[PDB]
Design a protein around this ligand. Sequence first.
Ligand code: ZN
Ligand code: ZN
Length: 746
Amino acid sequence: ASHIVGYPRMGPKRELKFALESFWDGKSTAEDLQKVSADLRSSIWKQMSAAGTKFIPSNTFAHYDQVLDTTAMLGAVPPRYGYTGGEIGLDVYFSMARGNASVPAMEMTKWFDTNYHYIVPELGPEVNFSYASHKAVNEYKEAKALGVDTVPVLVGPVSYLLLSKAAKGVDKSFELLSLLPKILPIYKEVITELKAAGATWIQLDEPVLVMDLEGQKLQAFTGAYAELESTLSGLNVLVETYFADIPAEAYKTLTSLKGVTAFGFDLVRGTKTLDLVKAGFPEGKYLFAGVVDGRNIWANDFAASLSTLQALEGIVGKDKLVVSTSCSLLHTAVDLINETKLDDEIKSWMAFAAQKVVEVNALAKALAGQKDEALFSANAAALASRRSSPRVTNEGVQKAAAALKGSDHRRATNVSARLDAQQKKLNLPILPTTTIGSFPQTVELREDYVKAIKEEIKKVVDLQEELDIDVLVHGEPERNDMVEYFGEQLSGFAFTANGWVQSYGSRCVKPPVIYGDVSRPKAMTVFWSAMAQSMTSRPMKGMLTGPVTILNWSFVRNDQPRHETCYQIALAIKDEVEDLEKGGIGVIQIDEAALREGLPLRKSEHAFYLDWAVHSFRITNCGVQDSTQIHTHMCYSHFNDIIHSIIDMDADVITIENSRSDEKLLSVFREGVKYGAGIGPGVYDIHSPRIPSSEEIADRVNKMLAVLEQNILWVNPDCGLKTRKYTEVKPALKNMVDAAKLIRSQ
Ligand SMILES: [Zn+2]
Ligand SMILES: [Zn+2]
């Protein structure tokens, strides 16, 4: 009775990532891939079953995205790609996914609240669905032809649409959920083909049920499962859900659904859902206790599990209890056993995909007999050491009794009271010019001062000679990733070697690991900033990476709250800001692009996030002279519904991912607001190699002089500049203060 909701699809060494690019660029027959893909599938099925894995998912693979695999199942393939019909393949899957030369790909978004991205279905009243992608059914026969019988994981009809989006044209008054009966048969055709394939169980992921559907939307679910009951005759169905706890209503509608004989809840992030089952439950259905994190990287507290996993036996037990992972072990890493650089003591404190597969099986076993007491002894030990090893609990739990000690608004001063100061002790003209954060390279190698400043100084002599430029920027050369960097300079901050995660396409990321109560005993920036602000006579702004962002983009421990760790990571910051303070530097820019990314799916749960999230940003400079001028960064174009928190951060100047949105919607910083401060909406989108006309920025800004103010304005880019080339970046900025100097004439 062991189930695993999903699994990674790139390799224990990122194979698919490369077999994709080999292919992608024209360096391998479309068979090299398949010889590859198949060589992976074969391993996972095999490696999963060999462990005792009961339900082994089939169709969790994907050359690109689960949601696209679905879009291909119904032949929803867009119109700009030119699809006539037939069994889709490569040319059209990636065409849509990556965009070919002549016509662009399809917009991508987040897989709920995870750091993965999916391909948003582009639907409407004119798309003609077609059963044009037998991936599902094929991979089943494959694995089967390999000795193992698998479970056909699939995306839920309704959920598919909910997550879908109606592309251009379609009148606004359209019901994106009206396609239900048009797509519901193409769903049938599948079912029956697999039914007749040899399948005994099947899986339907419907995570949206863990969102907030109003009474009307919920229904959608029913009207669609009462249409399948016929097709699902004498065949168990397992509807999946994850990343949250399901609301009474949603819980009801679900546990009552027609045709479904088993349900699975992410009981790691939704342990409230239990209370609704304790209260009421269906007949003798199946319960897939999803207690094995497929989100983080630590060995599931066996003891606990087995205790709760037991508690459930009480709700059922008549043989319908099944151990399962919480979410998909796709969102985690792969095989922990590709880690050595990490001292053993710690790998004992982890477990990645591969490890998790087993995890499910030892609790699977131990809850039925054969219990390798050699795991729980080893387990409770893995535990033992963590909740004790002085590497964990530190005298860093120092600045806490001094934390609950009131918030930390910046030394009062109704900003416009300090702004005056930040003028005398820092001059400047109207609309002071500046940039965003990083810059391009040259040859590069991978002493270090004879080659260090070498460029740090050219950036200097270039940022100066360049149309003057009131305020300047250093250029983060002495780093790698704004996050990767600061890491190895804080306490509970270890790093991994092979533990990778996907973030769309071949693209993958290796988020740092937070172990013990974080802390920066030693200085981290200082001279690197005083390096430049010693050469120039113009405002040199520092460079910090908010405690919000940092925290988010990383595997954060499971022994205490997100905020608690979060804040500590904010304390160390105040150490640095206060250093560019005493270190001289008058201006210190701080960024929090990864601000929104923490929003808890359950809306009523939001307000709290924005709590410790923003308070924390303040807990960075709540000890700064009324002369120091801090700027902040947020990579959002339309944060209209999160203006408050943005106004509560209390900053003298900021920046955002403006440039490609509205100049009239900017009048959102006043009506019922009135920010009274400085804002630098990136008038010019850096993410584009194509330089804009200097005749497009004067007005862009002249549309800001209207909806915004002129006695408080700034000049800068959309986002950072660590991708743009070099001949497309020089004849570029050489046209930014220009469109400003103008209007000043009066
Ligand atoms: Zn407030
Ligand atoms: Zn940016």
